[PDB]
mmCIF file with all atom_site columns, C-alpha atoms in Angstrom:
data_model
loop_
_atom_site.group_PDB
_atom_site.id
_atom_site.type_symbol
_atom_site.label_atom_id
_atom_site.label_alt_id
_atom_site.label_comp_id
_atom_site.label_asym_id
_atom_site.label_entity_id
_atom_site.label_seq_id
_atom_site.pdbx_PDB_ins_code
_atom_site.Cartn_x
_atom_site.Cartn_y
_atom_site.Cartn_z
_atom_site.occupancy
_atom_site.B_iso_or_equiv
_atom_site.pdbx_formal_charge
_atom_site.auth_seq_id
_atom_site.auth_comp_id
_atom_site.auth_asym_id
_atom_site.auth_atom_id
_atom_site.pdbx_PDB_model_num
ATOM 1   C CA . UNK A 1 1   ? 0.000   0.000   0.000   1.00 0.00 ? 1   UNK A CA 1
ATOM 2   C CA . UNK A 1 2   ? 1.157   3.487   -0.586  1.00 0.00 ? 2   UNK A CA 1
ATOM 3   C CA . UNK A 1 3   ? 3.128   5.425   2.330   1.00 0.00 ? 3   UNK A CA 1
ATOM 4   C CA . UNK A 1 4   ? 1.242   7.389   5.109   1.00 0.00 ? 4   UNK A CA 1
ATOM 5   C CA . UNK A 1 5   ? 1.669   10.996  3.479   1.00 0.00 ? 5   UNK A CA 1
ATOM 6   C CA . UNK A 1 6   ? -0.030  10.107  0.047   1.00 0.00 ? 6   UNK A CA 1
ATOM 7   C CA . UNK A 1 7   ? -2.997  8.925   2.270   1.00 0.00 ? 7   UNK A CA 1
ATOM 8   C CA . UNK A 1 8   ? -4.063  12.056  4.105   1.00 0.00 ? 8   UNK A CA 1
ATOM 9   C CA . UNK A 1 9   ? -2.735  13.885  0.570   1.00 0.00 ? 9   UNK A CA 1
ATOM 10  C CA . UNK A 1 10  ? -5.688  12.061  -1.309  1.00 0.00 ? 10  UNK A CA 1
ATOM 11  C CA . UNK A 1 11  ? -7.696  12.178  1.580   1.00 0.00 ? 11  UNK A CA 1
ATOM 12  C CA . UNK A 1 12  ? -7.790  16.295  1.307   1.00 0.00 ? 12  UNK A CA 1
ATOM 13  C CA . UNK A 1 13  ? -7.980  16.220  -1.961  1.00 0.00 ? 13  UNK A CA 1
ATOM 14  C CA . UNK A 1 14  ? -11.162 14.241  -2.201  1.00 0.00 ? 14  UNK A CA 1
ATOM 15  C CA . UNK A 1 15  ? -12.714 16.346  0.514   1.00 0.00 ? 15  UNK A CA 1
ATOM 16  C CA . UNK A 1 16  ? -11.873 19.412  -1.442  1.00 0.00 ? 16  UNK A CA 1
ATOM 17  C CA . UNK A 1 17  ? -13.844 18.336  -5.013  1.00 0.00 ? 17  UNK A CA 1
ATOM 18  C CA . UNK A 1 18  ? -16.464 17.580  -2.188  1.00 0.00 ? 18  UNK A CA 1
ATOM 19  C CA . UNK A 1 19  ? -16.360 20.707  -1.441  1.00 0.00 ? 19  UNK A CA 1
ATOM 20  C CA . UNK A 1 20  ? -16.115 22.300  -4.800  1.00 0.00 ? 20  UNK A CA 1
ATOM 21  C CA . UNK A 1 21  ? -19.828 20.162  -5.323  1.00 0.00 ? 21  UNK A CA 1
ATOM 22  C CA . UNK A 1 22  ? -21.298 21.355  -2.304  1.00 0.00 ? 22  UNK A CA 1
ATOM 23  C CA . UNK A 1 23  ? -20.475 24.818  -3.515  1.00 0.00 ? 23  UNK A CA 1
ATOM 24  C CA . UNK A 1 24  ? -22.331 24.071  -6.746  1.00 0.00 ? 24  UNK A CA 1
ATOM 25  C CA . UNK A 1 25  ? -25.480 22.557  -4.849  1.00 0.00 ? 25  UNK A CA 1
ATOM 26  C CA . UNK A 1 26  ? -25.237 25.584  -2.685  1.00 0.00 ? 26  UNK A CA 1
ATOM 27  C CA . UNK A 1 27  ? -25.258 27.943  -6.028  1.00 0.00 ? 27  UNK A CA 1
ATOM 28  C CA . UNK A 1 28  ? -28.435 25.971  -6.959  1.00 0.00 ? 28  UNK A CA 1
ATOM 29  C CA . UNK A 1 29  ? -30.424 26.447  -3.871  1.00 0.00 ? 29  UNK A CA 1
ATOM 30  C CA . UNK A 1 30  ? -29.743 30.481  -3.938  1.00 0.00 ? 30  UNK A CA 1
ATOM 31  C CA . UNK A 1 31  ? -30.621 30.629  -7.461  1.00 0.00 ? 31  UNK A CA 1
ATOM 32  C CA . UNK A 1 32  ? -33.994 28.830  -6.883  1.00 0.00 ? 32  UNK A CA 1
ATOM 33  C CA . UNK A 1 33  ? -34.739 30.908  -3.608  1.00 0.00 ? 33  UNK A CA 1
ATOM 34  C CA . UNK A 1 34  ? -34.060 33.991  -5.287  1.00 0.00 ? 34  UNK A CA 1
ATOM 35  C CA . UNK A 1 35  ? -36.880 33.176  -7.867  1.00 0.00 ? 35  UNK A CA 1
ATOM 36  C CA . UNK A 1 36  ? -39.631 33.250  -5.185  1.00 0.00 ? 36  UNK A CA 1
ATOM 37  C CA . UNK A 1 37  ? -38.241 36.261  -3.383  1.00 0.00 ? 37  UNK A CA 1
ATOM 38  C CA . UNK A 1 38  ? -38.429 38.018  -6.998  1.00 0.00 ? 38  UNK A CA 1
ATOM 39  C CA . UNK A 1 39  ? -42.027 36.390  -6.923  1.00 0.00 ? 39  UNK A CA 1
ATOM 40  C CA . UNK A 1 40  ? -42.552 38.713  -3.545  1.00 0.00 ? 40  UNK A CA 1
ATOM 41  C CA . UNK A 1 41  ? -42.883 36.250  -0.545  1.00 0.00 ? 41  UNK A CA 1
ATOM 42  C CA . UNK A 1 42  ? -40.450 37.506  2.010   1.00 0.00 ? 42  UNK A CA 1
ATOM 43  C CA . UNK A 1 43  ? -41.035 34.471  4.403   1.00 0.00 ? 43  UNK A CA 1
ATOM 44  C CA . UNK A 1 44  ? -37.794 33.101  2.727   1.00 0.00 ? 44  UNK A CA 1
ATOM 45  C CA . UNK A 1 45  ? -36.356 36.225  3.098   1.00 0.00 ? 45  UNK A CA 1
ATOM 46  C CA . UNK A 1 46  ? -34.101 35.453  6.130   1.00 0.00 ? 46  UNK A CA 1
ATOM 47  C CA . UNK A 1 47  ? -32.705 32.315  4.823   1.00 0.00 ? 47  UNK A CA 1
ATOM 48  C CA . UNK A 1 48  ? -30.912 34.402  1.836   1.00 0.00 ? 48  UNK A CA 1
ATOM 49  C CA . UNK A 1 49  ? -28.617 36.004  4.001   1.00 0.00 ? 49  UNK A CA 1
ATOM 50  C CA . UNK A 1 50  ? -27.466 32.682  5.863   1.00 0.00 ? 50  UNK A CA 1
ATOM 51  C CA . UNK A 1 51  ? -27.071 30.585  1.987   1.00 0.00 ? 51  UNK A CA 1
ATOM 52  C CA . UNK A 1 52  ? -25.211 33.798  0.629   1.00 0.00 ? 52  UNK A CA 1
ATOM 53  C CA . UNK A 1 53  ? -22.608 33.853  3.675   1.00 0.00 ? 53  UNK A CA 1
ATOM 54  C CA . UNK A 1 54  ? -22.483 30.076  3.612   1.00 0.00 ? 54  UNK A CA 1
ATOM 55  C CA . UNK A 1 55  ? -22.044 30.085  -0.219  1.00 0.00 ? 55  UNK A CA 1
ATOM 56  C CA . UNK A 1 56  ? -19.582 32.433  -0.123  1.00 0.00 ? 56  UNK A CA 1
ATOM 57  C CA . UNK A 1 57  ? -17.796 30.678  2.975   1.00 0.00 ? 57  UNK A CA 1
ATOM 58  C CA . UNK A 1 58  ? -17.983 27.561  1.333   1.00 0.00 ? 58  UNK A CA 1
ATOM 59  C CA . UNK A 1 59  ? -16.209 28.952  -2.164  1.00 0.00 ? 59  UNK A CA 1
ATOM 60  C CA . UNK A 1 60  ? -13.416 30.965  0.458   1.00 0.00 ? 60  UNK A CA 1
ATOM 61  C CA . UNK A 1 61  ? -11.932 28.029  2.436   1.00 0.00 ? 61  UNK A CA 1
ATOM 62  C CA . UNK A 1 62  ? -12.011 25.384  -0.424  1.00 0.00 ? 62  UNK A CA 1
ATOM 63  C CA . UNK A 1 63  ? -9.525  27.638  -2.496  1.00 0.00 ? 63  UNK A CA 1
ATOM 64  C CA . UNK A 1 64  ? -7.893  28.602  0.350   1.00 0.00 ? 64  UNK A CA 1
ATOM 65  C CA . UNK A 1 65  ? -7.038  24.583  0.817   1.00 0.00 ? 65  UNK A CA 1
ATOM 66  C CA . UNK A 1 66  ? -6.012  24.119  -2.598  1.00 0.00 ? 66  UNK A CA 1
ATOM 67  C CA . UNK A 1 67  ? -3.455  26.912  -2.083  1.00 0.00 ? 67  UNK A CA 1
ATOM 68  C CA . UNK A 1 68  ? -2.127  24.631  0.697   1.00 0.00 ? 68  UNK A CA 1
ATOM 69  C CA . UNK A 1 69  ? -2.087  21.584  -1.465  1.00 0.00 ? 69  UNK A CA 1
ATOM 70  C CA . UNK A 1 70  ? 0.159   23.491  -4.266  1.00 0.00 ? 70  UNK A CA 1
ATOM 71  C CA . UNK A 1 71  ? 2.582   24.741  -1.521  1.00 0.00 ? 71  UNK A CA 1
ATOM 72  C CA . UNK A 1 72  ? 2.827   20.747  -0.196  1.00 0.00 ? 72  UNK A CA 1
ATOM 73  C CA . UNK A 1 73  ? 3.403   19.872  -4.063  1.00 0.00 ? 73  UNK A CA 1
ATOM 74  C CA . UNK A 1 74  ? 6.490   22.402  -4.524  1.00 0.00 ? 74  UNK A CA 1
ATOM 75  C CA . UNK A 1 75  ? 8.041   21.869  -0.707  1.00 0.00 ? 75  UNK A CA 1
ATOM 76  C CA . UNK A 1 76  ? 7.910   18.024  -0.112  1.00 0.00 ? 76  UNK A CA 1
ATOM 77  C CA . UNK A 1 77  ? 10.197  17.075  -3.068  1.00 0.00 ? 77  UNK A CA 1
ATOM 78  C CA . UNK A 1 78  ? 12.712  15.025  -1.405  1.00 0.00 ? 78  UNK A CA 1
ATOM 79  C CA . UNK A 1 79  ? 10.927  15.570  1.918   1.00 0.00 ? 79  UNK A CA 1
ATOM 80  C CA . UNK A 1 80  ? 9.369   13.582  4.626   1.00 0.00 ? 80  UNK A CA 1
ATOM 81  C CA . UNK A 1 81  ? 9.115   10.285  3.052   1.00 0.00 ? 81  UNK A CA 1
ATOM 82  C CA . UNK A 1 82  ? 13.252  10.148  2.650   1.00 0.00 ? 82  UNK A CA 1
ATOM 83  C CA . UNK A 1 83  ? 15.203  7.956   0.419   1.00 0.00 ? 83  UNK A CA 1
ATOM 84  C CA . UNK A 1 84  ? 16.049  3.983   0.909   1.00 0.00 ? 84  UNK A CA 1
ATOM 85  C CA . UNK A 1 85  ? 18.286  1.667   -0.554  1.00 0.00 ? 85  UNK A CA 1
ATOM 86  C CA . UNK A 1 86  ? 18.116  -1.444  1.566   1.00 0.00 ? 86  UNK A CA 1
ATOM 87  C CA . UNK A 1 87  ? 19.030  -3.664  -2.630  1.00 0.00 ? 87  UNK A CA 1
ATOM 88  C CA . UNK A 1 88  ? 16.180  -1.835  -5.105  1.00 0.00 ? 88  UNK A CA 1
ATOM 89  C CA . UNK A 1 89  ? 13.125  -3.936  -5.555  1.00 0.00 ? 89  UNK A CA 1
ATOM 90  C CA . UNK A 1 90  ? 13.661  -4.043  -9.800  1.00 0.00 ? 90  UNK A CA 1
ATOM 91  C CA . UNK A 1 91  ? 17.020  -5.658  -9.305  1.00 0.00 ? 91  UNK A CA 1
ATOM 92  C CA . UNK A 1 92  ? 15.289  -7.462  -5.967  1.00 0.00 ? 92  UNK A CA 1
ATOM 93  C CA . UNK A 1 93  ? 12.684  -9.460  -7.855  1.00 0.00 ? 93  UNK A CA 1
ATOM 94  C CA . UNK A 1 94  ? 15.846  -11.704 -8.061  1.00 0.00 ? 94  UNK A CA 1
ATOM 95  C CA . UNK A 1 95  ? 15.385  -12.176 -4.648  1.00 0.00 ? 95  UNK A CA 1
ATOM 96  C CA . UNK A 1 96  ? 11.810  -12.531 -3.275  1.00 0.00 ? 96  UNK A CA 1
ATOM 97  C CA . UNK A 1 97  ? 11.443  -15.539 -6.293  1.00 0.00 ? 97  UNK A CA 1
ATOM 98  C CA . UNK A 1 98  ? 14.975  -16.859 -4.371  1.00 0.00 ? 98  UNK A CA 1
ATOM 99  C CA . UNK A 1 99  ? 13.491  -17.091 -1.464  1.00 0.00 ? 99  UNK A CA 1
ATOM 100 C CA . UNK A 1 100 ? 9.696   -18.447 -2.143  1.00 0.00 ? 100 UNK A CA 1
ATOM 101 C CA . UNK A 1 101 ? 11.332  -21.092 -4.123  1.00 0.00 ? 101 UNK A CA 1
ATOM 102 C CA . UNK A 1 102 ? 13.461  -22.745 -1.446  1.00 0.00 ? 102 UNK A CA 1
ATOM 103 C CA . UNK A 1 103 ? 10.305  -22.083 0.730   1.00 0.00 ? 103 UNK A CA 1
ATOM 104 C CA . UNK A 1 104 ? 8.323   -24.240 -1.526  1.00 0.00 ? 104 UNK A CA 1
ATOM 105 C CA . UNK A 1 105 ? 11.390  -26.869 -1.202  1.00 0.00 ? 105 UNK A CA 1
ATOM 106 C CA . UNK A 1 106 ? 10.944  -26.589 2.118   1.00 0.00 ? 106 UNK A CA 1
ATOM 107 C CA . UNK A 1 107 ? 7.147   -27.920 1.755   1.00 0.00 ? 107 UNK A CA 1
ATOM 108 C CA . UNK A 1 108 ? 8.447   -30.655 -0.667  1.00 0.00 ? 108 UNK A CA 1
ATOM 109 C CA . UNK A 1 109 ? 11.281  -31.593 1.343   1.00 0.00 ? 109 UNK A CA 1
ATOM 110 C CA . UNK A 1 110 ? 9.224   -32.472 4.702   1.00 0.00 ? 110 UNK A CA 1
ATOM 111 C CA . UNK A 1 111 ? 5.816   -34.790 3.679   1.00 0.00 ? 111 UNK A CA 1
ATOM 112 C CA . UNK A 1 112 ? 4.178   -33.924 7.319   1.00 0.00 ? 112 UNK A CA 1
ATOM 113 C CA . UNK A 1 113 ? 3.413   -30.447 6.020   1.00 0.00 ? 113 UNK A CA 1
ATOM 114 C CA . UNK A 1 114 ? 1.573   -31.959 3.144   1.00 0.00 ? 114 UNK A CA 1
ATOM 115 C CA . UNK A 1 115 ? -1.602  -31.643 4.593   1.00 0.00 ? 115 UNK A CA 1
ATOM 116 C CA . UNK B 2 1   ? -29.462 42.683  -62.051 1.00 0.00 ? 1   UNK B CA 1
ATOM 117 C CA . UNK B 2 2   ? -32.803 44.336  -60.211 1.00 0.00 ? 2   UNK B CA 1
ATOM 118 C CA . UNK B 2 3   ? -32.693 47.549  -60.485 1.00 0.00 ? 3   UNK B CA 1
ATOM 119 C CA . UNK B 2 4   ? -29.337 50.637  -60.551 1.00 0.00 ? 4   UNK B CA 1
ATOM 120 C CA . UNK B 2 5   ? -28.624 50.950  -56.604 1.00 0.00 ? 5   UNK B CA 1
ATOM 121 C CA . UNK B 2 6   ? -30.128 54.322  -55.503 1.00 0.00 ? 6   UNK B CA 1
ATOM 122 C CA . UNK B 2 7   ? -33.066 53.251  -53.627 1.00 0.00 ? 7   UNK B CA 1
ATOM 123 C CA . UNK B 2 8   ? -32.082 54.603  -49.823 1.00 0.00 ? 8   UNK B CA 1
ATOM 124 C CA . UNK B 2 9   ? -32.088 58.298  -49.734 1.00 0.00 ? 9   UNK B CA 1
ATOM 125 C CA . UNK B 2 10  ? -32.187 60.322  -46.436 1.00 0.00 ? 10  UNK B CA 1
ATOM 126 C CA . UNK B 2 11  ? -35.502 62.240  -45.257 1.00 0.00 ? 11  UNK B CA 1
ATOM 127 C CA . UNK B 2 12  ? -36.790 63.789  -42.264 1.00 0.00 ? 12  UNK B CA 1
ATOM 128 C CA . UNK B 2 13  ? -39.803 63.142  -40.541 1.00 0.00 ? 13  UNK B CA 1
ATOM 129 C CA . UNK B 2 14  ? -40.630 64.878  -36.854 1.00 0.00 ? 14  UNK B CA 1
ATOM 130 C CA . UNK B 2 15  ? -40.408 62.850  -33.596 1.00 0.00 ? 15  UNK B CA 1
ATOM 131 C CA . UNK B 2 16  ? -44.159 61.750  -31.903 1.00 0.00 ? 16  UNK B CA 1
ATOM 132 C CA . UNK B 2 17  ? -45.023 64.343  -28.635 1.00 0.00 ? 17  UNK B CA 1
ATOM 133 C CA . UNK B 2 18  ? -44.576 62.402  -26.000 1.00 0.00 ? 18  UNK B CA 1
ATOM 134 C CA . UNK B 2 19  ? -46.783 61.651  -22.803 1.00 0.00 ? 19  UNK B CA 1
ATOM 135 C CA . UNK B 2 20  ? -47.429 59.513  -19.827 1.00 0.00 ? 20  UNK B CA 1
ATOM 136 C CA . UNK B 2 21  ? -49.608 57.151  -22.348 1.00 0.00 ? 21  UNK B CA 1
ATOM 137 C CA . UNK B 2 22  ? -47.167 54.766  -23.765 1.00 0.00 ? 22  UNK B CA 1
ATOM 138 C CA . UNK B 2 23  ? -43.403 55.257  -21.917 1.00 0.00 ? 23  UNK B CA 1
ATOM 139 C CA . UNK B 2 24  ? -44.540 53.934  -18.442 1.00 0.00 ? 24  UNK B CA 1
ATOM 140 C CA . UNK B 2 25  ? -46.663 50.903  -20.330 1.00 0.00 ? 25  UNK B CA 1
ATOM 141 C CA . UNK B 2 26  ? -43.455 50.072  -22.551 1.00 0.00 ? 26  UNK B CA 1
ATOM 142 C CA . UNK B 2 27  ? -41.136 50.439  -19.422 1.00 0.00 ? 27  UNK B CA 1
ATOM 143 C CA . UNK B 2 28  ? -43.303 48.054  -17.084 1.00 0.00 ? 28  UNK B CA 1
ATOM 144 C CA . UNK B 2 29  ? -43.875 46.002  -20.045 1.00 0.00 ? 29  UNK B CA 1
ATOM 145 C CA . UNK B 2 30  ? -40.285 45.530  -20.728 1.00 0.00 ? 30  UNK B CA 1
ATOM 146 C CA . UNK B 2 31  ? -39.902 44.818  -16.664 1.00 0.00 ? 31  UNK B CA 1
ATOM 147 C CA . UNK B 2 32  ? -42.821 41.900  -17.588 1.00 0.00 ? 32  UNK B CA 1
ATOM 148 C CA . UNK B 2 33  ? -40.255 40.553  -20.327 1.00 0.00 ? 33  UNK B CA 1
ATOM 149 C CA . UNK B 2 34  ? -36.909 40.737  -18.364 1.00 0.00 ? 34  UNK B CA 1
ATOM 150 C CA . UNK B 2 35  ? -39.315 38.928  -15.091 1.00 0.00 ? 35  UNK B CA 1
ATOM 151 C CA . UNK B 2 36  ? -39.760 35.787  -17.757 1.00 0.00 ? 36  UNK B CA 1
ATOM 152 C CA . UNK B 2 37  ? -36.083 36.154  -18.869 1.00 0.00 ? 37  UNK B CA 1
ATOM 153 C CA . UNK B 2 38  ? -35.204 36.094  -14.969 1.00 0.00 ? 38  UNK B CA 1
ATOM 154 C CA . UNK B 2 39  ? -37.420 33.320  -14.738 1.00 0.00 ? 39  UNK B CA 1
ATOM 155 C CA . UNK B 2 40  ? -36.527 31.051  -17.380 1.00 0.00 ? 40  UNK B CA 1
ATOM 156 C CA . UNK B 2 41  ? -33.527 31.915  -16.254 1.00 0.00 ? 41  UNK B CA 1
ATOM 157 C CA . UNK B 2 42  ? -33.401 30.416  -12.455 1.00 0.00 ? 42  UNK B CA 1
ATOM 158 C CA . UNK B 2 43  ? -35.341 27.482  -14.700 1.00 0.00 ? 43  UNK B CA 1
ATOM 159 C CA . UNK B 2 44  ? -32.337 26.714  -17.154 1.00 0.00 ? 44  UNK B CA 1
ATOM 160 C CA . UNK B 2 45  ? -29.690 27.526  -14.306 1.00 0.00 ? 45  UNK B CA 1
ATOM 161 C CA . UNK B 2 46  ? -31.184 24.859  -11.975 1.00 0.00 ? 46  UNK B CA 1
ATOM 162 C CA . UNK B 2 47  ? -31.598 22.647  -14.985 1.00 0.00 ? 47  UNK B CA 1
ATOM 163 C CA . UNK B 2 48  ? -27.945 22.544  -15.438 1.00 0.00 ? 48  UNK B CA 1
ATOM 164 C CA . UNK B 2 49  ? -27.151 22.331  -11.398 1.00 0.00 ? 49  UNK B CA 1
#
């Protein structure tokens, strides 16, 4: 599986395009209120002002977020998840099918295991 | 091939006296028009939402 910083990396990623759809629904619901209060009921008046701040709330933070994201794509080259070398898995397949194979020996060699 | 181009020459004629009688019909009649465009307007917006 992939390291631990990829993880919360996709992780706030998805909750941002979440975001980015709530925003949309958000836009929907103020442009079907504002039909009616053009239609002169002003019972739904008091709800515009609480979907207008939350719409606009909502379209702030979620940018501000993605500004965060772009910062952790320029700073983390090299960074946090550091370089290893204990032997390089492409050369190392050499090794993992050395060592299941003399396991499977193994299974051959003793007949009690058969089983 | 219909006829030697001179057809449109320029003329005056006097602009209509106005009065209350037609500007404040055209004017709410043309806020009647742009309250449909607002409305099939929220319509095709939520459409596409």
């Amino acid at each position: 599986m992939q390291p631990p910083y990829i993880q919360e990396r996709l992780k706030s990623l998805n909750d941002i395009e979440t975001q980015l759809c709530s925003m949309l629904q958000e836009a929907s619901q103020v442009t079907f209120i504002f039909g009616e209060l053009k239609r002169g009921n002003e019972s739904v008046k008091p709800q515009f002002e609480n979907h207008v701040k939350q719409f606009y709330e909502r379209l702030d933070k979620s940018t501000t977020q993605l500004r965060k994201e772009i910062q952790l794509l320029d700073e983390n080259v090299g960074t946090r998840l550091l370089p290893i070398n204990v032997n390089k898995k492409a050369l190392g397949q050499d090794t993992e099918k050395m060592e299941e194979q003399l396991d499977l020996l193994s299974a051959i060699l003793d007949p009690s295991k058969s089983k | 091939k219909v006829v030697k181009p001179s057809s449109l020459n320029s003329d005056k004629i006097p602009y209509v006296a106005p009065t209350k009688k037609e500007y404040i019909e055209l004017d709410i009649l043309n806020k009647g028009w742009k309250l449909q465009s607002l409305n099939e307007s929220k319509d095709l917006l939520r459409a596409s939402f």
